[PDB]
Amino acid sequence: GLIVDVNGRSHENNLAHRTREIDRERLIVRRGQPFSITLQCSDSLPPKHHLELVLHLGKRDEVVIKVQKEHGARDKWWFNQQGAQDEILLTLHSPANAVIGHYRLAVLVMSPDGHIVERADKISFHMLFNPWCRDDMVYLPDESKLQEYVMNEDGVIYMGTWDYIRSIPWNYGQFEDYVMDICFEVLDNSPAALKNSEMDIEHRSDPVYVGRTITAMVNSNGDRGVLTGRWEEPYTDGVAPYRWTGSVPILQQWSKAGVRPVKYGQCWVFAAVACTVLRCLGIPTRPITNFASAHDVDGNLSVDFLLNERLESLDSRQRSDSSWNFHCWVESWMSREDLPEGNDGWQVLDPTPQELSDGEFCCGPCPVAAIKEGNLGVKYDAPFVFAEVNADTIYWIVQKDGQRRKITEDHASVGKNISTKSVYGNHREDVTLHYKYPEGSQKEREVYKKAGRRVTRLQLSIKHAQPVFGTDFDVIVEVKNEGGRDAHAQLTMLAMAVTYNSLRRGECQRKTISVTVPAHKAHKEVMRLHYDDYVRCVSEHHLIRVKALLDAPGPIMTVANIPLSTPELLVQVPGKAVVWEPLTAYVSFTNPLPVPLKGGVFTLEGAGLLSATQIHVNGAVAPSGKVSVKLSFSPMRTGVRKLLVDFDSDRLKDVKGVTTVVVHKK
């Protein structure tokens, strides 16, 4: 009868555990780090009476831990008890291999004979990974990187083409309301948890297991996964992937709907959502983007790509055109005690199912080091991840008489400018060398040799002035003869619309010329692409793949992907911003299309600023007319925050904007 109320001191514990952004009113703790709560008593522990503590995990007590009285093991939970005044200070010490999850704490007061004389109200708390605790497997010994890879809620995911990289800001929002609760829900709806709940809980102490589970639930899991993938345009009953500016709306939707795959997502949306959840649970994570991605190859390090003389895949039915313009995945920091010495550090987790086992096989965790050094023998999915960044595709002109002509290509190579956001600033950090030895290096030769990667004048090149969607433009194809004698050759050029995942769409023009380019001189040919022609074939990403063949008197090829730009939203939220103080944000742009756009919707969101919110343009924006809306709202948390905005319309899609707003109030 002595315990009047247990006090978790969450405002305090949560501050110490870097979990208070999530919530202050409930105890959210990290493992391997102690936490202190108090027992407010009415009087005193009856003479020969002592305290007992037992922990409960699982909706059905799948796991119960009796916490030690003191000097405990190292991987053993234990507590220290001390009296303050009219309350008892209980400092709980958890092992660094503690199971993450929602615990319910039962403090028992007992008779000296072995019987419970009273039991206090079972209070619950959540436990996350602790990369700041040196004994934790996710330990990262640099506080500045944990701030970006765990604590930062605003990221930048790179896209576009390797020679023309674009950035799209993303609101990971891992500390937005309830996103933590949904993260444990994703773990609770997985096959393993459904099949055997208790064993699954027991495995939740492992960053490898939990990382592989989250990566699997984001998309590959078809009945309860988080997102439904749709690789092409008619996104009939859902949101198009290029619409999202953050992960929280997808997660709230998935849970709100009773755990129901969200329509729809594409590779970078799976990675960003994976990032939000792993960062939330405490595993250091960063979205990485690969340009010229050998995703399509399905693990094969050698592909000969047969084209006909008209420069086309031999089978008219097949729509895929080799390597993706880019492809995204995620890198998570953790030590790999499940593998030989040396694979510790960043692991590649690819939520995007692998090509040829239909939306079934996600990738990783795979040591990025196993990729660099070519060890395809470690779990998980090293061959597939090594192919993604190393596969060798050789194109061939096969004639109607079976003669195969090898196309020489200058543009070549896969895994071009592997990028991730910079820890300081929003700069692109080229992370390629973490993945591969420089091209041609003898080091590259001996790894390709080890792993099975095959290991093997006129100059063709395509150039453009970065066109804006809506305009007709020219693209130059220049043949440089840096030889001594004159050279006459046949120059074939085509321009076809494409999707980032290399899905061939509309061949909006071809052309073959006969050329004689003189020694040390260069011939420049132009191809004029027009709006009314390419609106017909281009998609939400507005991409045009230009190719040029130069049958050199073997044949020479060069491909270029042209991403046509959309206007950039002007986002402004003027005057000093203060928490819980109403403010007005202003977004505006000018229709670059000589067509009216209707169905204009602006969607706004920001971690700590506001949850996705829509502004419907009433009417239709006239051709070349300026659009201008505004929304009022009151920031939720203080800090340097980023406001994200998306604009969609019938004729203008994929239009973004971001602004930095410093939220005050000391």
Curated annotation (Swiss-Prot):
Q: Which Gene Ontology molecular function entries are recorded, alphabetically?
A: calcium ion binding; GTP binding; histone dopaminyltransferase activity; histone serotonyltransferase activity; peptidase activity; peptide histaminyltransferase activity; peptide noradrenalinyltransferase activity; protein-glutamine gamma-glutamyltransferase activity
Spell out the SUPFAM superfamilies in the cross-references. Cysteine proteinases (SSF54001), E set domains (SSF81296), Transglutaminase, two C-terminal domains (SSF49309)
Tell me where on the tree of life, at the top rank, the source sits: Eukaryota
Q: How is its activity regulated?
A: Acyltransferase activity is regulated by the binding of GTP and Ca(2+): inactivated by GTP, which stabilizes its closed structure, thereby obstructing the accessibility of substrates to the active sites. In contrast, Ca(2+) acts as a cofactor by inducing conformational change to the active open form. In absence of Ca(2+), Mg(2+) may bind Ca(2+)-binding sites, promoting GTP-binding and subsequent inhibition of the acyltransferase activity.
Any idea where this protein resides?
Answer: Cytoplasm, Cytosol; Nucleus; Chromosome; Secreted, Extracellular space, Extracellular matrix
> Which cofactors are required for activity?
Ca(2+)
An annotated GO cellular component: nucleus
Q: Which reaction does it catalyse?
A: L-glutaminyl-[protein] + L-lysyl-[protein] = [protein]-L-lysyl-N(6)-5-L-glutamyl-[protein] + NH4(+); L-glutaminyl-[protein] + serotonin = 5-serotonyl-L-glutamyl-[protein] + NH4(+); L-glutaminyl-[protein] + dopamine = 5-dopaminyl-L-glutamyl-[protein] + NH4(+); L-glutaminyl-[protein] + histamine = 5-histaminyl-L-glutamyl-[protein] + NH4(+)
Annotated disulfide bonds:
none
Which residues are recorded as binding Ca(2+)?
A: 390, 392, 429, 439, 444
Instruction: Please tell me whether the keyword Magnesium is annotated for this protein.
Output: no
GO BP, one example?
A: protein homooligomerization
Q: What is its main location?
A: cytoplasm
Q: Which family does it belong to?
A: Belongs to the transglutaminase superfamily. Transglutaminase family.
Quote the function comment for this protein.
Calcium-dependent acyltransferase that catalyzes the formation of covalent bonds between peptide-bound glutamine and various primary amines, such as gamma-amino group of peptide-bound lysine, or mono- and polyamines, thereby producing cross-linked or aminated proteins, respectively. Involved in many biological processes, such as bone development, angiogenesis, wound healing, cellular differentiation, chromatin modification and apoptosis.
Subunit description: Monomer.
Protein name (database record): Protein-glutamine gamma-glutamyltransferase 2
Please report the organism this UniProt entry assigns to the protein.
Pagrus major
